[PDB]
Amino acid sequence: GLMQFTLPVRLCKEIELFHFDIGPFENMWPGIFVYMVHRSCGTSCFELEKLCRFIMSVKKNYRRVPYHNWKHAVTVAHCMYAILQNNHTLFTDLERKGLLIACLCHDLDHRGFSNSYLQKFDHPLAALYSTSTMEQHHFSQTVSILQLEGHNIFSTLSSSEYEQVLEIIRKAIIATDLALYFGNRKQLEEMYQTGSLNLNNQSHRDRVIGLMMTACDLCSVTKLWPVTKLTANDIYAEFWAEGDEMKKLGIQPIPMMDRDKKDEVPQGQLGFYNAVAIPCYTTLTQILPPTEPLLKACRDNLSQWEKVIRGEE
Numbered sequence: 494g495l496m497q498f499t500l501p502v503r504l505c506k507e508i509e510l511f512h513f514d515i516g517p518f519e520n521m522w523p524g525i526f527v528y529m530v531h532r533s534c535g536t537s538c539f540e541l542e543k544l545c546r547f548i549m550s551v552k553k554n555y556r557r558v559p560y561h562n563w564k565h566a567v568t569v570a571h572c573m574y575a576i577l578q579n580n581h582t583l584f585t586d587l588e589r590k591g592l593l594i595a596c597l598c599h600d601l602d603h604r605g606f607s608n609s610y611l612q613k614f615d616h617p618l619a620a621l622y623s624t625s626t627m628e629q630h631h632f633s634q635t636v637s638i639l640q641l642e643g644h645n646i647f648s649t650l651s652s653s654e655y656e657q658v659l660e661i662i663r664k665a666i667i668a669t670d671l672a673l674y675f676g677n678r679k680q681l682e683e684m685y686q687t688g689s690l691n692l693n694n695q696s697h698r699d700r701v702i703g704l705m706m707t708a709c710d711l712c713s714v715t716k717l718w719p720v721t722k723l724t725a726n727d728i729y730a731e732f733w734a735e736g737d738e739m740k741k742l743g744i745q746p747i748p749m750m751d752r753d754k755k756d757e758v759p760q761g762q763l764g765f766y767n768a769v770a771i772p773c774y775t776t777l778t779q780i781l782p783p784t785e786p787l788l789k790a791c792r793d794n795l796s797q798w799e800k801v802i803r804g805e806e
């Protein structure tokens with residue numbers, strides 16, 4: 494129990510900041526996650542033997558795709574760590590335990606293709622899960638890894654606490670289905686503005702947790718410009734692979750997914766920042782004021798994309 498993880502001084506300081514980049518050294522990512530669990534949750538939340546075995550089985554079940562990979566998993570968990578650390582007293586012990594694990598697991602076994610491509614392909618998962626196809630798969634994969642011998646990091650919870658944390662993780666993971674974010678955010682916007690938002694109302698907490706999951710999931714738009722810009726290439730490498738597979742089914746893909754229409758990328762990012770990211774971090778900042786640095790970083794990156802269009806880069 495007296496074994497802390499400790500990071501080098503530069504990481505020890507920068508990890509606390511929303512805009513931290515976890516770096517190109519893969520073998521440090523498990524250590525970074527465990528550090529974040531210890532500071533966010535406690536050195537007791539989990540038996541280190543089981544947590545380490547859980548982390549390595551999760552890593553194994555992320556594939557070698559350009560964006561939806563183990564690095565995304567750890568990045569999204571770090572943004573959740575930054576939110577939880579800046580909002581100390583607003584979250585239960587069970588929520589802090591659940592949300593870091595949900596973030597690490599949220600895209601388990603992703604192949605780099607959207608729910609739409611699975612449906613048009615007629616992939617068997619599209620028959621098993623009619624909506625939120627990949628997200629219901631990611632939750633299924635999370636439960637499977639939890640049930641491997643030696644992997645049940647929640648085994649020391651009471652029966653009811655166990656049902657509650659698995660229910661936090663399921664809603665958290667389903668909420669990363671971007672098609673569900675638009676309605677979730679409108680509802681939170683109305684509740685905030687009419688004054689009826691109530692964090693002791695579980696249905697409202699669920700909604701606020703869903704928005705946090707979206708905010709963490711999108712956190713590549715909230716880094717320093719060079720990280721944001723170089724991550725956008727990984728994102729587009731999957732989009733264009735999906736675009737190619739669409740053309741193989743005899744369907745012209747949307748221009749965002751068409752590698753012939755790379756010119757339209759900067760305008761595509763404008764649309765995405767204005768339609769999705771800016772509104773997401775605005776409502777989040779309204780509900781949880783200390784998450785303002787994510788909105789400020791996102792606006793900065795919006796401005797960097799405007800500069801790309803004006804030929805200034």
Ligand SMILES: COc1ccc2c(=O)n(C)c3c(C)nc(-c4ccccc4Cl)n3c2c1
Nearest residue numbers: 669670671710711712713714728761762765
């Ligand atoms: C409608 O789906 C889009 C379109 C464009 C983007 C995009 O441009 N960015 C930056 C993005 C970022 C940073 N995470 C995502 C994303 C979120 C959930 C699921 C899959 C992805 Cl890929 N997206 C996007 C998603």
Ligand SMILES: [Mg+2]
Nearest residue numbers: 599600627669
């Ligand atoms: Mg996902």
Ligand SMILES: [Zn+2]
Nearest residue numbers: 565599600710
């Ligand atoms: Zn994701």
